[PDB]
């Protein structure tokens, strides 16, 4: 009770000194970074040495008093002095005292079950241990070539995010008494809020070190690291006891953590998006965003949107580009040519027009590019290095590691490279690569031979007999190529050389973004066609728990089920907004206007008639017998109410199995029709989910009532509200404008409002008028 | 508790 | 418990089997999907477990199969 | 005589397979059960066999 009223007197005494008192007042409140920035700059020359200095005398130790003295006997054992009333050195509430007094506590210390406490706070490095305990292991010894510098995700964790957003996440679940209301992260990304929230927040211990370590927890360390070519993100976090120039150890890739799936899934989600967009030209721009933003992905523990998904991924894939340039992601340093990706290490020069001929006597325009350029190729267990000078291939070599993926490599890199034995392979190319079927779309021309080579096997060995052939002269034995992708260097191609090895790949932080052109080609940096097209032609549709929405062309709607759904979605979206809505009758504690909403009798027609009343009359009991405040589960009051609306007969017969159009949905149970989750908000019907957000009093959230409960906006501060703390907001009633304390000290106003809407829409649409 | 085959997909 | 499946403590999923689509009864399984099967996973955090992780993997991959 | 013994470390990496003709080449290089049970049959013990 006195540490509120000591710090009150406390800061009466700094605001009667007028030095001190100026410095708090003039200024926004971040000049507290800049104020702690001017304290304790002083360090010690020494690392260890001042260390050991240090720890020289019996008594060096600044350590806390009143828990000693609470807990514990400050004298010793072996009449060895332990604690003194003086304060020295440095004047602060803290008592010095001897370092033995640590290791008593440590022993006799009376304390009892804080081990469940601690691990999942670390669950970072307690994972790291897990991991390790599920291996197997070998020995052995080789000169190995490792890969020198790749920039690859360590210590990865579920659900990684940025460093803002996370930042978001760490002042949300340290204290909801100073936090501002973030918008963008919280709405989406709840759930993973709950969590986390649920489990740090009502044990109050350590709270600065629990949000600095939960910093680390998500964020995995992408530097710049040889590899000896296990590039899964799992085994970079230990690769010293694992490999390295001269090392080698085994059964290692088995035990993984199920991110690195995870991610090969969004790949094939982008995929059949971008697939999506593929089928209407009439618009690319327009679609794709939309099938973006209405996709939701379930990662193992959590639900998430598809758009921060990709917008904040890692992993830059040939389709993630393509999903990324819709939105307003920054991902640069990546080139993506069909299923080769490729980086920019040298040069410059403009794109220019050259028609060349085929051997159907036709001409067709090519684009190729006049510059001298060196980048750095790289495909699957294949890496190499080209120059380009002028549409021909400069200089070239090949560090890959297998035959066929050398001679892929040379392959599509010729196809970049664009020379002129391009042309005189046309053996059928028109009849076919020469249209693509999409809407009458003629296809880009590198793409169209790259998929001739792409058909069969012959015609991989049609433009490797393209480039010049010779025998290799001594000394170029182990350098040369064979067209079959061997060293033996009887024959070998011209203007290309093996390396024993690997090729080290280029790095650069840069972030570039441009919009994207009609037929998903992203210009971007003013050229540089980095979109690729369609990268792989896969038609296929397989997908496990992933959700999808509006119109999405692909047919997983019956007409009955969306008729449930649909009429569920009414309900439960249309309500929350203010009087004569769900919140208002249950705060009002009257259900008889919830029984006769206009949004229920859309739903009646749907029910099974020969039962109709007896539903009607469990329902109506259930939704009347939780009325009763603290007693009520919000989710099935949205599952029984359509019933209700019917007269109630007596049935006698039992309700549980609700046929809607022959359909069953039961209290509780979740099922096909209805998901009830647990210990979270939303809900599943069939392959899609929904959830209302701004008012939920259900009373499995009670971790965040306070952050569940924001449906509000701010208006104007002009009457005085009372100052509510955050808990006594939920008593304020619709329409009511109130006054908050808002994060760092700055306090707005608000009501009980309809959410924020169109926050991208609004402006995409006028744009899209003013053309 | 005497209560064998449950699930059904219905 | 050196039996190859367990006997009292097994569990049961009811599905009525039509003459054509359990003839294969591989597909069974297939079928069994459809309903509330696919939705079911397990957390992390085992009890009395040897090697939670590869089981869940090979869990993933078997609904993912 | 058989198919033989085969050597092992603790590191259960690396195995070393024995013919029944080499046994008397690794010797004490057997358990002592083995190695009491082989030595008497060394007197009848012919290359690959015993009389």
């Given at each position: 009770?006195?540490?509120?009223?000591?710090?009150?007197?406390?800061?009466?005494?700094?605001?009667?000194?007028?030095?001190?008192?100026?410095?708090?007042?003039?200024?926004?409140?971040?000049?507290?970074?800049?104020?702690?920035?001017?304290?304790?700059?002083?360090?010690?020359?020494?690392?260890?040495?001042?260390?050991?200095?240090?720890?020289?005398?019996?008594?060096?130790?600044?350590?806390?008093?009143?828990?000693?003295?609470?807990?514990?006997?400050?004298?010793?054992?072996?009449?060895?002095?332990?604690?003194?009333?003086?304060?020295?050195?440095?004047?602060?509430?803290?008592?010095?005292?001897?370092?033995?007094?640590?290791?008593?506590?440590?022993?006799?210390?009376?304390?009892?079950?804080?081990?469940?406490?601690?691990?999942?706070?670390?669950?970072?490095?307690?994972?790291?241990?897990?991991?390790?305990?599920?291996?197997?292991?070998?020995?052995?010894?080789?000169?190995?070539?490792?890969?020198?510098?790749?920039?690859?995700?360590?210590?990865?964790?579920?659900?990684?995010?940025?460093?803002?957003?996370?930042?978001?996440?760490?002042?949300?679940?340290?204290?909801?008494?100073?936090?501002?209301?973030?918008?963008?992260?919280?709405?989406?990304?709840?759930?993973?809020?709950?969590?986390?929230?649920?489990?740090?927040?009502?044990?109050?211990?350590?709270?600065?070190?629990?949000?600095?370590?939960?910093?680390?927890?998500?964020?995995?360390?992408?530097?710049?690291?040889?590899?000896?070519?296990?590039?899964?993100?799992?085994?970079?976090?230990?690769?010293?006891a694992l490999g390295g120039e001269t090392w080698i150890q085994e059964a290692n890739t088995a035990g993984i953590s199920n991110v690195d799936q995870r991610k090969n899934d969004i790949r094939a989600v982008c995929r059949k998006v971008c697939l999506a967009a593929n089928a209407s030209?009439?618009?690319?721009?327009?679609?794709?965003?939309?099938?973006?933003?209405?996709?939701?992905?379930?990662?193992?523990?959590?639900?998430?949107?598809?758009?921060?998904?990709?917008?904040?991924?890692?992993?830059?894939?040939?389709?993630?580009?393509?999903?990324?340039?819709?939105?307003?992601?920054?991902?640069?340093?990546?080139?993506?040519?069909?299923?080769?990706?490729?980086?920019?290490?040298?040069?410059?020069?403009?794109?220019?027009?050259?028609?060349?001929?085929?051997?159907?006597?036709?001409?067709?325009?090519?684009?190729?590019?006049?510059?001298?350029?060196?980048?750095?190729?790289?495909?699957?267990?294949?890496?190499?290095?080209?120059?380009?000078?002028?549409?021909?291939?400069?200089?070239?070599?090949?560090?890959?590691?297998?035959?066929?993926?050398?001679?892929?490599?040379?392959?599509?890199?010729?196809?970049?490279?664009?020379?002129?034995?391009?042309?005189?392979?046309?053996?059928?190319?028109?009849?076919?690569?020469?249209?693509?079927?999409?809407?009458?779309?003629?296809?880009?021309?590198?793409?169209?031979?790259?998929?001739?080579?792409?058909?069969?096997?012959?015609?991989?060995?049609?433009?490797?007999?393209?480039?010049?052939?010779?025998?290799?002269?001594?000394?170029?034995?182990?350098?040369?190529?064979?067209?079959?992708?061997?060293?033996?260097?009887?024959?070998?191609?011209?203007?290309?050389?093996?390396?024993?090895?690997?090729?080290?790949?280029?790095?650069?932080?840069?972030?570039?973004?441009?919009?994207?052109?009609?037929?998903?080609?992203?210009?971007?940096?003013?050229?540089?066609?980095?979109?690729?097209?369609?990268?792989?032609?896969?038609?296929?549709?397989?997908?496990?728990?992933?959700?999808?929405?509006?119109?999405?062309?692909?047919?997983?709607?019956?007409?009955?089920?969306?008729?449930?759904?649909?009429?569920?979605?009414?309900?439960?979206?249309?309500?929350?907004?203010?009087?004569?809505?769900?919140?208002?009758?249950?705060?009002?504690?009257?259900?008889?206007?919830?029984?006769?909403?206009?949004?229920?009798?859309?739903?009646?027609?749907?029910?099974?008639?020969?039962?109709?009343?007896?539903?009607?009359?469990?329902?109506?009991?259930?939704?009347?017998?939780?009325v009763t405040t603290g007693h009520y589960s919000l989710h099935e009051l949205i599952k029984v109410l359509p019933f209700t609306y019917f007269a109630p007969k007596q049935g006698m017969f039992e309700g549980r199995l609700f046929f809607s159009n022959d359909s069953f949905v039961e209290?509780?149970?979740?099922?096909?029709?209805?998901?009830?989750?647990?210990?979270?908000?939303?809900?599943?019907?069939?392959?899609?989910?929904?959830?209302?957000?701004?008012?939920?009093?259900?009373?499995?959230?009670?971790?965040?009532?306070?952050?569940?409960?924001?449906?509000?906006?701010?208006?104007?501060?002009?009457?005085?509200?009372?100052?509510?703390?955050?808990?006594?907001?939920?008593?304020?009633?619709?329409?009511?404008?109130?006054?908050?304390?808002?994060?760092?000290?700055?306090?707005?106003?608000?009501?009980?409002?309809?959410?924020?809407?169109?926050?991208?829409?609004?402006?995409?649409?006028?744009?899209?008028?003013?053309? | 508790?005497?209560?064998?085959?449950?699930?059904?997909?219905? | 418990?050196?039996?190859?499946?367990?006997?009292?403590?097994?569990?049961?999923?009811?599905?009525?089997?039509?003459?054509?689509?359990?003839?294969?009864?591989?597909?069974?399984?297939?079928?069994?999907?459809?309903?509330?099967?696919?939705?079911?996973?397990?957390?992390?955090?085992?009890?009395?477990?040897?090697?939670?992780?590869?089981?869940?993997?090979?869990?993933?991959?078997?609904?993912?199969? | 005589?058989?198919?033989?013994?085969?050597?092992?470390?603790?590191?259960?990496?690396?195995?070393?397979?024995?013919?029944?003709?080499?046994?008397?080449?690794?010797?004490?290089?057997?358990?002592?059960?083995?190695?009491?049970?082989?030595?008497?049959?060394?007197?009848?013990?012919?290359?690959?066999?015993?009389?």
């Open positions: 009770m006195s540490l509120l009223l000591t710090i009150a007197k406390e800061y009466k005494r700094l605001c009667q000194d007028a030095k001190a008192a100026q410095m708090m007042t003039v200024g926004t409140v971040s000049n507290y970074t800049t104020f702690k920035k001017w304290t304790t700059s002083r360090k010690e020359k020494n690392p260890s040495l001042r260390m050991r200095w240090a720890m020289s005398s019996k008594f060096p130790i600044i350590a806390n008093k009143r828990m000693l003295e609470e807990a514990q006997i400050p004298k010793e054992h072996n009449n060895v002095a332990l604690w003194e009333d003086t304060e020295d050195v440095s004047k602060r509430d803290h008592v010095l005292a001897s370092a033995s007094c640590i290791n008593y506590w440590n022993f006799c210390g009376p304390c009892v079950n804080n081990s469940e406490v601690i691990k999942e706070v670390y669950k970072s490095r307690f994972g790291r241990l897990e991991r390790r305990k599920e291996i197997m292991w070998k020995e052995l010894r080789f000169t190995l070539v490792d890969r020198q510098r790749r920039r690859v995700d360590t210590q990865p964790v579920e659900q990684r995010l940025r460093t803002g957003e996370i930042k978001d996440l760490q002042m949300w679940t340290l204290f909801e008494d100073e936090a501002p209301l973030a918008s963008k992260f919280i709405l989406d990304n709840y759930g993973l809020v709950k969590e986390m929230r649920s489990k740090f927040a009502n044990k109050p211990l350590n709270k600065e070190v629990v949000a600095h370590m939960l910093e680390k927890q998500f964020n995995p360390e992408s530097r710049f690291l040889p590899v000896f070519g296990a590039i899964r993100p799992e085994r970079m976090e230990l690769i010293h030209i009439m618009n690319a721009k327009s679609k794709l965003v939309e099938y973006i933003k209405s996709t939701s992905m379930r990662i193992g523990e959590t639900e998430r949107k598809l758009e921060e998904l990709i917008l904040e991924t890692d992993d830059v894939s040939p389709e993630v580009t393509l999903c990324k340039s819709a939105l307003g992601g920054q991902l640069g340093k990546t080139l993506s040519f069909g299923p080769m990706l490729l980086k920019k290490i040298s040069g410059s020069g403009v794109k220019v027009k050259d028609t060349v001929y085929i051997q159907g006597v036709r001409a067709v325009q090519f684009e190729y590019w006049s510059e001298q350029e060196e980048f750095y190729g790289e495909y699957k267990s294949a890496t190499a290095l080209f120059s380009r000078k002028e549409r021909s291939l400069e200089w070239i070599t090949i560090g890959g590691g297998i035959n066929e993926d050398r001679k892929r490599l040379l392959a599509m890199c010729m196809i970049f490279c664009r020379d002129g034995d391009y042309f005189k392979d046309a053996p059928a190319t028109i009849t076919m690569a020469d249209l693509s079927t999409k809407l009458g779309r003629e296809i880009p021309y590198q793409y169209v031979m790259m998929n001739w080579i792409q058909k069969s096997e012959d015609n991989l060995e049609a433009l490797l007999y393209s480039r010049g052939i010779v025998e290799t002269n001594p000394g170029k034995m182990g350098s040369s190529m064979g067209i079959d992708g061997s060293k033996r260097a009887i024959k070998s191609l011209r203007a290309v050389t093996i390396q024993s090895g690997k090729i080290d790949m280029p790095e650069s932080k840069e972030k570039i973004h441009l919009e994207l052109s009609d037929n998903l080609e992203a210009f971007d940096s003013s050229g540089r066609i980095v979109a690729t097209i369609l990268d792989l032609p896969s038609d296929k549709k397989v997908t496990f728990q992933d959700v999808s929405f509006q119109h999405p062309d692909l047919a997983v709607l019956r007409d009955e089920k969306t008729a449930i759904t649909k009429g569920y979605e009414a309900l439960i979206k249309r309500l929350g907004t203010g009087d004569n809505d769900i919140p208002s009758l249950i705060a009002k504690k009257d259900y008889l206007s919830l029984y006769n909403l206009p949004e229920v009798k859309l739903m009646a027609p749907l029910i099974r008639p020969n039962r109709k009343g007896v539903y009607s009359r469990v329902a109506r009991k259930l939704v009347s017998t939780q209290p509780g149970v979740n099922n096909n029709v209805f998901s009830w989750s647990k210990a979270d908000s939303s809900k599943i019907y069939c392959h899609g989910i929904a959830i209302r957000v701004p008012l939920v009093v259900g009373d499995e959230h009670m971790d965040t009532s306070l952050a569940l409960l924001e449906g509000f906006s701010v208006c104007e501060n002009d009457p005085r509200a009372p100052m509510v703390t955050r808990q006594d907001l939920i008593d304020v009633g619709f329409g009511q404008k109130v006054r908050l304390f808002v994060g760092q000290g700055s306090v707005r106003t608000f009501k009980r409002t309809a959410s924020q809407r169109a926050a991208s829409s609004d402006v995409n649409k006028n744009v899209k008028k003013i053309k | 508790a005497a209560a064998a085959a449950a699930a059904a997909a219905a | 418990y050196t039996h190859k499946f367990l006997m009292e403590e097994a569990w049961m999923f009811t599905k009525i089997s039509d003459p054509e689509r359990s003839r294969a009864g591989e597909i069974l399984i297939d079928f069994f999907k459809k309903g509330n099967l696919s939705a079911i996973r397990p957390k992390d955090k085992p009890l009395q477990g040897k090697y939670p992780i590869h089981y869940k993997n090979l869990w993933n991959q078997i609904k993912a199969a | 005589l058989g198919q033989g013994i085969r050597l092992s470390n603790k590191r259960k990496t690396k195995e070393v397979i024995i013919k029944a003709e080499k046994m008397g080449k690794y010797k004490n290089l057997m358990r002592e059960e083995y190695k009491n049970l082989f030595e008497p049959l060394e007197k009848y013990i012919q290359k690959d066999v015993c009389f």
